[PDB]
Design a protein around this ligand. Structure first.
Ligand SMILES: COc1ccc2sc(N)nc2c1
Length: 185
């Protein structure tokens, strides 16, 4: 891909984070804490899952960013509508305002309804996310494997401003403590 030149500087929005997340001072890394992080609750925070949004809102143009997933067993990445549900149980699907992929139990899947099996030969340590708002496209790239395509959502019906979307995953196993990191340009 030649999407690198639409690079955007993403930062995490603390106010949207699940109350167990620890976001770095620079707002570029997030990990699961082993306890509640001593913040007040609010209607914006994701309650059920270890999710957080980027601060940036996109309503036009082409945007690209990269995320480091090194040594994680579970995570979700992509974009979502600014108005997605925050509280209670929900599935990650376009119908609910999400355009995501994930790793779970040694398989990679795209968040379609129902979910789509991904075919990844080289387990990624860094993922590139490309959004073309006008074209209705969200694409995922394997930066570890020379930028190879992972998945394209096309004919997307965004129906609102978009925000970068992250899930660090639970750490029941003790093998998923590592952070998600936004990679430098
Ligand atoms: C790549 O794995 C990492 C990186 C940073 C940290 S801080 C912590 N408690 N666990 C980890 C694991």
């Amino acid at each position: 891909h030649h999407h690198h030149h639409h690079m955007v500087h993403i930062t995490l929005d603390r106010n949207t984070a699940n109350s167990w997340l620890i976001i770095s001072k620079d707002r570029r890394q997030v990990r699961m804490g082993d306890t509640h992080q001593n913040v007040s609750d609010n209607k914006e925070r994701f309650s059920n899952y270890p999710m957080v949004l980027g601060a940036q809102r996109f309503s036009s143009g082409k945007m690209y960013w990269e995320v480091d997933v090194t040594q994680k067993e579970a995570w979700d990445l992509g974009v979502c509508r600014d108005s997605v549900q925050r509280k209670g149980q929900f599935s990650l699907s376009p119908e609910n305002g999400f355009w995501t992929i994930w790793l779970w139990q040694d398989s990679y899947e795209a968040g379609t309804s129902p979910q789509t099996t991904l075919h990844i030969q080289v387990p990624p340590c860094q993922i590139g996310i490309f959004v073309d708002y006008e074209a209705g496209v969200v694409s995922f790239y394997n930066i570890t494997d020379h930028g190879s395509l992972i998945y394209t959502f096309s004919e997307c019906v965004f129906a609102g401003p978009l925000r970068p979307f992250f899930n660090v995953g639970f750490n029941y196993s003790g093998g998923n403590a590592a952070p998600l990191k936004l990679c430098p340009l």
